[PDB]
Amino acid sequence: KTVVVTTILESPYVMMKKNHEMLEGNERYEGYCVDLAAEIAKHCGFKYKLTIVGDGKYGARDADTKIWNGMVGELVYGKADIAIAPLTITLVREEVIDFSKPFMSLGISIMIKKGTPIESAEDLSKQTEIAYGTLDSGSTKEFFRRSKIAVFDKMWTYMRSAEPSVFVRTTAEGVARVRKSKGKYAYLLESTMNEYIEQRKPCDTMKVGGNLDSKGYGIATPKGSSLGNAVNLAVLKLNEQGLLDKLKNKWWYDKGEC
Amino acid sequence: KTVVVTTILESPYVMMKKNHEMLEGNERYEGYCVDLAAEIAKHCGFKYKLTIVGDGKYGARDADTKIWNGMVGELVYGKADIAIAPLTITLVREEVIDFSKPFMSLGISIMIKKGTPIESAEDLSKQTEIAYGTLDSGSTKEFFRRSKIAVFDKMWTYMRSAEPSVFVRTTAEGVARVRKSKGKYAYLLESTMNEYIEQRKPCDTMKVGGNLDSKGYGIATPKGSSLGNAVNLAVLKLNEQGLLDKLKNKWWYDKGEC
Numbered sequence: 131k132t133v134v135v136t137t138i139l140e141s142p143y144v145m146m147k148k149n150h151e152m153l154e155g156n157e158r159y160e161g162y163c164v165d166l167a168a169e170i171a172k173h174c175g176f177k178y179k180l181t182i183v184g185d186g187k188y189g190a191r192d193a194d195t196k197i198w199n200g201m202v203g204e205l206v207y208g209k210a211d212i213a214i215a216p217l218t219i220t221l222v223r224e225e226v227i228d229f230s231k232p233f234m235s236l237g238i239s240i241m242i243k244k245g246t247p248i249e250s251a252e253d254l255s256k257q258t259e260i261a262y263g264t265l266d267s268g269s270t271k272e273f274f275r276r277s278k279i280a281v282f283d284k285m286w287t288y289m290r291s292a293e294p295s296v297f298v299r300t301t302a303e304g305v306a307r308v309r310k311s312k313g314k315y316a317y318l319l320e321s322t323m324n325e326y327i328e329q330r331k332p333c334d335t336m337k338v339g340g341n342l343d344s345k346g347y348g349i350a351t352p353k354g355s356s357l358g359n360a361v362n363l364a365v366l367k368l369n370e371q372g373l374l375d376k377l378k379n380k381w382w383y384d385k386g387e388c
Numbered sequence: 389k390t391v392v393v394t395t396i397l398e399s400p401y402v403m404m405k406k407n408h409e410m411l412e413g414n415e416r417y418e419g420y421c422v423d424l425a426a427e428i429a430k431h432c433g434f435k436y437k438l439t440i441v442g443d444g445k446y447g448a449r450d451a452d453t454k455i456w457n458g459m460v461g462e463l464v465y466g467k468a469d470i471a472i473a474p475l476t477i478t479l480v481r482e483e484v485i486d487f488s489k490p491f492m493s494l495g496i497s498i499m500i501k502k503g504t505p506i507e508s509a510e511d512l513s514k515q516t517e518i519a520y521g522t523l524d525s526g527s528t529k530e531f532f533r534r535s536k537i538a539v540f541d542k543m544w545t546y547m548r549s550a551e552p553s554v555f556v557r558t559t560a561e562g563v564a565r566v567r568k569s570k571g572k573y574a575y576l577l578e579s580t581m582n583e584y585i586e587q588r589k590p591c592d593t594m595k596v597g598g599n600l601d602s603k604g605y606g607i608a609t610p611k612g613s614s615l616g617n618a619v620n621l622a623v624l625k626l627n628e629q630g631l632l633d634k635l636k637n638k639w640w641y642d643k644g645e646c
């Protein structure tokens with residue numbers, strides 16, 4: 131009966147509330163996806179439990195074991211009924227789980243420390259002084275691994291071989307590396323995250339250039355789940371009624387510190 | 389056997405070729421959706437025939453008879469197997485037909501004659517010297533009919549009762565109205581169309597302000613069509629390989645005349 135929702139701690143989508151140790155169950159968390167889950171649940175008429183994905187991963191299939199990890203894995207192996215998270219709709223995932231129409235649009239983007247002489251991916255690919263990398267697992271790293279586009283292939287060829295690693299375990303790690311590297315590390319990350327961090331103190335980062343690609347986040351369910359239809363219709367209704375635009379403003383810009 | 393594709397003449401998605409009269413079948417047409425249809429068919433392995441929707445409409449349900457018209461109607465009543473067009477994914481349509489994930493993002497936007505003293509929807513709403521309207525049927529009109537947002541509800545109240553009608557039968561008529569009205573008509577239209585027209589001679593229009601909403605176009609099939617799965621996967625593959633971005637550049641900006 132109670133729907134198990136898998137999600138991931140990624141600001142400002144899902145965050146621990148300041149007083150979380152005093153709170154129980156779903157009340158421990160806040161953020162864009164916490165708000166969205168409550169609306170999806172109200173509109174589809176189900177009770178739910180938010181659970182943070184155990185391995186802290188979005189979802190990839192291991193080439194060796196062929197096992198899926200992360201939120202995708204939780205759906206594929208029946209540990210969760212729905213994923214409500216900044217989970218990128220991709221072909222390889224759509225083969226194993228179902229996605230709603232997108233609730234947010236985004237693209238891969240460049241984050242620099244202010245004053246870094248970089249305006250584009252082409253700029254990054256033509257030089258070697260400034261290192262650059264991505265989140266170590268996820269759709270951004272896979273975009274680069276798989277790209278046949280010359281500039282992105284060049285960038286991947288550099289990143290896959292760079293030592294020490296240019297890849298990071300978490301967005302927070304990537305942002306800290308930008309901030310601490312004196313302009314010598316740029317971070318490739320999803321544009322929505324880039325925009326959020328740009329509005330956070332110490333206000334020393336910025337998004338530069340256009341997005342490298344265009345894609346979306348969707349709500350995911352196990353392939354063939356009965357919940358999928360209602361969830362998809364709910365996403366469409368909430369977009370049409372302006373809920374999604376309101377939530378982005380609430381969590382990105384209303385609180386902006388810059 | 390051969391898949392019947394319904395589409396609509398709307399630039400630069402589907403246009404007749406300059407020499408279209410010396411050509412037959414699918415060869416009469418060119419454009420973003422013509423190229424897209426070719427790629428979808430190649431990846432899904434079907435042969436197809438492009439047909440222009442008989443009533444020239446996108447699709448809406450008659451409130452009295454409950455009959456669907458336009459491309460949506462062609463799918464609903466089994467006259468076509470798939471619609472490959474700038475067809476907006478909406479809740480009411482998703483209830484009666486299936487949509488792929490979106491192949492293009494867009495939002496409602498404002499087109500003005502250059503020099504018109506308007507920067508936003510709010511500006512249009514606060515004045516009466518400059519008239520404004522939308523395509524007389526389709527998702528844009530419906531956005532205003534249904535909007536609870538104050539500025540948009542205000543705009544709708546004006547538009548529904550304006551005389552003579554501020555509504556137009558085709559985009560071409562809307563653009564012509566802007567161009568001939570000496571700044572006294574502004575046109576509300578999908579951002580993709582607005583961006584295309586801004587780059588065509590006589591180069592006398594521009595898009596102003598941000599988009600009023602965010603949505604997507606999707607490839608549509610009849611509810612429960614087997615074709616639906618393959619087509620959806622095909623759209624995701626085409627996006628991931630950069631083909632959709634290549635097509636947008638080809639049809640909007642490579643050709644730019646301004």
Ligand SMILES: N[C@@H](Cn1cc(Cl)c(=O)[nH]c1=O)C(=O)O
Nearest residue numbers: 188217218268269270319320323
């Ligand atoms: N959304 C991605 C995960 N993800 C997240 C961020 Cl913030 C990023 O910059 N890159 C990613 O791959 C996915 O679903 O794999």
Ligand SMILES: N[C@@H](Cn1cc(Cl)c(=O)[nH]c1=O)C(=O)O
Nearest residue numbers: 446475476526527528577578581
């Ligand atoms: N895409 C829409 C139709 N459509 C098209 C244009 Cl160009 C517009 O400005 N407004 C619309 O409603 C639909 O699917 O109804």
Ligand SMILES: [Zn+2]
Nearest residue numbers: 146148150151
């Ligand atoms: Zn804590």
Ligand SMILES: [Zn+2]
Nearest residue numbers: 169170172173
């Ligand atoms: Zn609600």
Ligand SMILES: [Zn+2]
Nearest residue numbers: 404407408409
């Ligand atoms: Zn002719």
Ligand SMILES: [Zn+2]
Nearest residue numbers: 427430431631
């Ligand atoms: Zn292809």
